[PDB]
């Protein structure tokens, strides 16, 4: 079963026999989705400071649509919005649906300040017309000063 990613997968193989070594031509397996969401996911995200955490929703569907994106964070990363409803784990972003033009994209921003050492799992749920899907992203943090 193919892994879930927007990028094109390049599979490659080599073979060994008494005849000799043979490298097969690289097979490009393209994995695409009509309506999907992806985010920057910065590396190491220093602790104590708030981050912009920008992401973009893509619509390849010819017809227009309205999208809703909510964020759920494990304990703990300080959020500037709140509250958590209905479930204690589920974090409502109180998302207002914005119009996304056909063959266009829209911007999504989340201001969050991590309070503890990573890596912590942070979910971004996407509620939209033409189906809905949620991706799981991990956020890692690092202490302020460094001396080895």
């Amino acid at each position: 079963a193919l892994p879930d990613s927007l990028t094109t997968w390049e599979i490659q193989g080599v073979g060994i026999s008494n005849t000799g070594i043979c490298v097969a031509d690289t097979v490009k397996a393209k994995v695409f989705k009509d309506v999907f969401l992806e985010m920057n996911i910065p590396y190491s995200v220093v602790r104590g400071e708030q981050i912009q955490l920008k992401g973009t929703v893509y619509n390849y569907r010819t017809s227009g649509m309205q999208f809703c994106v909510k964020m759920s964070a494990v304990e703990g990363i300080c959020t500037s919005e709140s509250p958590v409803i209905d479930h204690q784990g589920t974090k409502s972003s109180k998302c207002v649906r914005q119009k996304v033009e056909g063959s266009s994209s829209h911007l999504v921003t989340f201001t969050v300040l991590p309070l503890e050492i990573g890596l912590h799992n942070i979910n971004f749920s996407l509620e939209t017309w033409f189906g809905k899907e949620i991706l799981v992203k991990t956020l890692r943090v690092v202490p302020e000063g460094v001396k080895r």
Partner: protein, 148 residues
């Protein structure tokens, strides 16, 4: 194998110069093509492209002064963009010397591409392009040097 923090870039940015290395005719006029494509093979619809120019003495030198002029900002349309940059105005007083004879050394150009439709960023660069008074070079291939 390289050990680094890769971040795993979202889209590919390829920089194709019309000519490999700048000659006499290309000093007054130099055109360069900037083309950025997603990893799912679908070209970037619309994005903002910022170009940075600079001059370097050698390849080993990581740091050198630069203009101070532009910083020309053009928008990537349908996965392709192009811009013309002349050396005559470029170097001048900014590089403290102006001539093709005065400065014989590499030219480094930086490109920063951001998506206008949604948050993402990718960067690329050209290690260098040297202005040479003596074009090309000469070499022999598949020609053993012997006489019959």
């Amino acid at each position: 194998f390289e050990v680094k923090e890769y971040v795993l870039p979202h889209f590919s940015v390829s920089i194709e110069p019309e000519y490999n290395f700048i000659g006499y005719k290309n000093f007054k006029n130099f055109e360069i093509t900037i083309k950025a494509r997603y990893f799912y093979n679908k070209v970037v619809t619309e994005a903002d492209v910022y170009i940075t120019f600079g001059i370097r003495e050698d390849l080993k030198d990581d740091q050198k002064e630069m203009m101070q002029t532009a910083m020309q900002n053009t928008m990537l349309i349908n996965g392709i963009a192009q811009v013309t940059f002349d050396s005559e105005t470029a170097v001048k007083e900014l590089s403290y010397y102006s001539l093709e004879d005065l400065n014989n050394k590499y030219l480094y150009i930086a490109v920063t591409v951001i998506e206008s439709t949604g948050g993402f960023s990718e960067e690329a660069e050209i290690p260098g392009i040297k202005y040479v008074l003596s074009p090309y070079k000469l070499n022999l291939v598949a020609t053993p040097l012997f006489l019959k």
